[PDB]
């Protein structure tokens, strides 16, 4: 399956947290292609900004093997 590597930052506008939040704040992750759409929207709705998107696995414009 095609996979997306995504780097995104989400700021904690609702409440300040004492424990280290660095992993939550700035995260690079591998997303299944199907999941990414929903995830992208969720980051937008949070007000986080998606710094970088790349397709980790799979071939661009593939009819099959997707």
């Amino acid at each position: 399956s095609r996979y997306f590597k995504v780097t995104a930052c989400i700021p904690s506008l609702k409440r300040v947290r004492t424990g280290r939040e660095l992993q939550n704040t700035f995260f690079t992750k591998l997303v299944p292609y199907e999941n990414w759409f929903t995830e992208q929207q969720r980051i937008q709705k949070a007000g986080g900004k998606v710094l970088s998107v790349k397709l980790f696995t799979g071939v661009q414009g593939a009819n099959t093997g997707v």
């Binding site: 009819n63 099959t64 093997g65 997707v66």
Partner: protein
Amino acid sequence: SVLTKAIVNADAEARYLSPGELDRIKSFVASGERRLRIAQTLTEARERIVKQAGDQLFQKRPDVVSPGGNAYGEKMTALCLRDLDYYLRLVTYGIVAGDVTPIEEIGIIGVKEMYNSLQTPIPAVAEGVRAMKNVATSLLSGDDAAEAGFYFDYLVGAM
């Protein structure tokens, strides 16, 4: 394909291929040569299958080729036949693969959404595929026809 499906299940389980899985692969490779011939037959008869099925569909559904209907007009009728041709090509691919997965990616995912935007009636499309199956079955030998039927049935089920 059969093999792709088996590998994928194994990878999810993070295990080597199970004996049963291996056996199915063995059966498939033996079947393949026969499958290739079945596919070849349909390819040669493709033009006639589409034509005959189209006529049957239009007889079954006068409405589709009527001023209201989507199929109506030369441009539209051509597109309807082109669609039937597409599905036949997909079915041939399926027979050689031994699995519907190749068919499924190209044709069956998002099909509802595409046709709804077009406003083409999905049941009529299904009837066309059924019609194609009947034509294809006649040209194929009985055992060959049964194999081909499964793929045709899947398409009808999908839409």
